[PDB]
Amino acid sequence: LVQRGRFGRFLRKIRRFRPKVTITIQGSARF
Numbered sequence: 001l002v003q004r005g006r007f008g009r010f011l012r013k014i015r016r017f018r019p020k021v022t023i024t025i026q027g028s029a030r031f
Helices: 022-030
Strands: none
């Protein structure tokens, strides 16, 4: 392992801001 929640999900591997910005980029690749 090499991460804490503060560095695993703090506008880093999720973002998902109210209008949805990078989560959409991830969503394009995933789906």
